[PDB]
Assembly symmetry: D2
Homo-oligomer: 215 residues x 4
């Protein structure tokens, strides 16, 4: 039920340090090529008082290229879909929790996202908007208690050079019984391609490919 | 006069655990100078709650803490304007709860606007299986960092079979006006659910807290 | 087994960021009043290139005043004694692992201590010796898998004010079957009372008292 | 060039796990430019080892990593004078291991002095019950901070009955002379025990590592 070219629609409602906001996005991707892009609009809470990069890994592992020799948990879960929950622990104490419920209508994936971040220090790179980009990363995926887990430890490049680390822990839950994968990896690369001064409009790109490590 | 011997509480929580939304409203009373409060809580949406009610109860205000004259009281100084706080609660099995409270004052009644979001509680864990009994008493340590008051507490839920399930709280407190800042100190806490109905649609909750400076006694 | 006045002898061997050192100590204390004091000398690896305070909580919960209300896992364990293992995680990523095997010879406890600290940054408060003292602390003890655990989240105060946080996780192991206590707390207060310029001589004091949290009606209301 | 296509390794490790000391010595050989190495290891004291041998094996040299010309090689620039590293290893049930290695070069032989200290491994956990199978392949990220090189790796042990036991590595790498610092990059690893006797008094250990810089925008898969 996956076509070479899929559409994406999403809404995110959330809060950082107790300030609410809301973002909507339309996008396109090629699930068997592991590539997606999307345009995102802030609809409430603008101009955002925090670094936009903390949102972008939240904005669907169906858009990862899986080799034949690895079980693809995500494409197997449609038409019914799947959801995920995630905690993002930054190295200065900032914590974000996020959830995404992913459903499918026709050729369009539809995401409902909730995001809540707390304890970002006022003088930190997130609240001062001093991030540049996420570095390329490698996610580890493994089964525990009948569902799929993913961990990624990565970092944001910063305006003066330097790196601000963050650790992701994700739980993926298919809405039907699916084949379960063995331990594997997905390399990711996400960038903001364009944006306006206050990030009211963002064009965002991601590329992901599954592997098995040093062969 | 601002902070009276007896005060009222009004609150609404909205939140989600593992992506399941719910909402709760509360009405209560307390004694700010005695460090004691109680409240009755009603699930308004998302009931019956499919998780342990105990992960909510420390989210349901440090103005209700007995401060000796030895220690600057950040929280009573902050009224009438009020203060807000943010907290992350890290459970030893990977369950993470983020919460925020904005606390204002209308006459003799505190009003809380609470948001709660928990993720990654495992289906077979004591939270989703409702195997918790109560929070142990705890000691919070409060200290200033970069102009605001921080509080940390490492504590544990007692569980049904005997056993303890640990959690780390990290709270940032932000007064809404400039107040005098306290030196490093502690608050001892003790929170209990004194009654509840079977599915916890109605909960009666009590807390007791006193600040101190540690040893000597 | 446990006299009102007891003595202490210790030897610690360790490394910080891969640089080795060794310290010997003698002392005295009162296990029932929760007080002790010891004199410490650097034998090897001096002058110490790191903040001495990272060592001092490693230099025995037998020196803690327990009420009869709370089962005393530690006083129960002698003559045989007990051991403990500890990891201390500082907020900037420096980690110290320590072990202590505690035996008893006459009225003198003997400690065999090992200490290993890694990843302290060059310009942090440990390597640059900007620490002042440990704050008073509260360690929570609880049973798991038939042994006693204790966790403490505390902090060192810094030179120009401010605090440097550290989490301790300790495992206590009696060398014999003892009765295990319920969940409880030990308050602590550790202080360096005197030292010379580079801490090759240090006099250290500790006071420690067990309790069970905020009471419904506290006893401290007129005899 | 001080780095040759074939080079030998000599090492001694002394350490302890939950207070029980041991020592291992090893001899090996590896090809730094192909990123491969093998070694034979012998328990010299403290055997038979009461813990899973796997906790030791990532401690038994990033000079044996295949670096492309595209990425600065911090480790091969550091010789002959060499470099040292410190590491904490944080297992998901509370077990923690701190380790250090001081690496020098003698002729064309690498010499390691290793210190290992692990604490708080539960008695019924997979390490003390020896229920581990192997480390999964891993990816290390490397970045500069405070003018030295850091490496982090989050990985897991595979366990006998199925399932995985996670561990987080944090390493500091310090050249002994001034070298040029790399940009953010990665090393994929793969470590396996090729053979061992029943109590692991003798082990043959192999490792493969290659450096890279992440998912390419297009990549050299053009044909």
């Amino acid at each position: 039920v996956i076509k070479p070219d899929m559409k994406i629609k999403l809404r995110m409602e959330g809060a950082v340090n107790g300030h609410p906001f809301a973002i909507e996005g339309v996008g396109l991707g090629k699930p068997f090529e592991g590539k997606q892009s999307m345009d995102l609009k802030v609809k409430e809470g603008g101009p955002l008082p925090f670094a936009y990069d903390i949102l972008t890994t939240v904005f669907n592992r169906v858009f990862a290229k899986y080799p034949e020799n690895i079980v693809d948990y995500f494409k197997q879960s449609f038409p019914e879909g799947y959801s995920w929950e995630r905690s993002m622990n930054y190295e200065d104490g900032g914590i974000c929790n996020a959830t995404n419920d992913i459903t499918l209508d026709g050729d369009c994936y539809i995401y409902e996202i909730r995001f809540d971040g707390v304890n970002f220090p006022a003088n930190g790179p997130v609240m001062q908007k001093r991030t540049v980009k996420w570095e390329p990363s490698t996610e580890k995926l493994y089964v525990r208690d009948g569902v799929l887990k993913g961990d990624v430890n990565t970092a944001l490049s910063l305006e003066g050079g330097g790196h601000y680390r963050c650790d992701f822990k994700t739980t993926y839950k298919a809405k039907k019984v699916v084949q379960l994968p063995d331990y594997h990896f997905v390399d990711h690369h996400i960038e903001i391609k364009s944006h306006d001064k206050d990030y009211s409009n963002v064009n965002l790109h991601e590329h992901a490919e599954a592997h098995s490590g040093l062969p």
